[PDB]
Amino acid sequence: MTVAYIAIGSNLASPLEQVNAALKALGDIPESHILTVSSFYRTPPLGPQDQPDYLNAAVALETSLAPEELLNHTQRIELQQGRVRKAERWGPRTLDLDIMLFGNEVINTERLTVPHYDMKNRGFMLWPLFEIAPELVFPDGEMLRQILHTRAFDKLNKW
Ligand SMILES: Nc1ncnc2c1ncn2[C@@H]1O[C@H](COP(=O)(O)CP(=O)(O)OP(=O)(O)O)[C@@H](O)[C@H]1O
Ligand SMILES: Cc1ccc(C(=O)CSc2nc3nc(N)[nH]c(=O)c3[nH]2)cc1
Ligand SMILES: [Ca+2]
Ligand SMILES: [Ca+2]
Ligand SMILES: [Ca+2]
Ligand SMILES: [Cl-]
């Protein structure tokens, strides 16, 4: 088994309902078990700001799936919860499931890049991650606690 850490975001179609449904669906992923769920946070949008605030959270999922097989499931869940692709970059969505980390693995395939390319620059990813995994060390040896101690991020407000 490996522990994967998944970021959850939603800012459309009742984010609390979307995230609760997503958590049930994550539980139903085969060869996998949810270990920990963060608090839910209400976060101002990064990127385009003309969209509603996000519900953000993080989940620890123990799994024996291959990383791309996990991605298959997370994409399926997003699509089954009505995620629609529009033209605008970084627009609102019913559900976003980003694979932040897959154990200590570094993955670079056509479909999957892990660690998530920008997670170390996003408070809405790092704070919920720290809530569920305060001892976390990244594949490059960087400590989550040290990033959050050193770098300026706004505090997150709970939903
Ligand atoms: N770690 C990861 N988790 C989830 N998807 C990933 C990924 N690495 C690459 N991808 C790929 O990312 C593609 C596009 O995903 P999108 O959800 O549209 C980007 P986003 O989440 O809105 O922005 P962001 O990546 O800046 O957070 C997916 O089709 C998937 O193949
Ligand atoms: C500079 C920059 C930084 C981050 C981002 C993104 O996170 C991609 S789109 C997005 N914006 C978001 N804002 C918040 N608060 N939460 C998200 O899940 C979320 N997803 C886009 C641009
Ligand atoms: Ca399961
Ligand atoms: Ca994202
Ligand atoms: Ca995504
Ligand atoms: Cl697999």
Curated annotation (Swiss-Prot):
CDD domains: HPPK. Its EC number is 2.7.6.3. Keywords: ATP-binding, Folate biosynthesis, Kinase, Nucleotide-binding, Transferase. Transmembrane segments: none annotated. SUPFAM superfamilies: 6-hydroxymethyl-7,8-dihydropterin pyrophosphokinase, HPPK. Pfam families: HPPK. It comes from the Bacteria. The keyword tRNA processing does not apply. GO terms for biological process: folic acid biosynthetic process; tetrahydrofolate biosynthetic process. Thermostable. Retains 75% of its activity after heating 30 minutes at 96 degrees Celsius. Pathway: Cofactor biosynthesis; tetrahydrofolate biosynthesis; 2-amino-4-hydroxy-6-hydroxymethyl-7,8-dihydropteridine diphosphate from 7,8-dihydroneopterin triphosphate: step 4/4. Catalyzes the transfer of pyrophosphate from adenosine triphosphate (ATP) to 6-hydroxymethyl-7,8-dihydropterin, an enzymatic step in folate biosynthesis pathway. Belongs to the HPPK family. This is 2-amino-4-hydroxy-6-hydroxymethyldihydropteridine pyrophosphokinase. It comes from Escherichia coli (strain K12). The gene is folK.
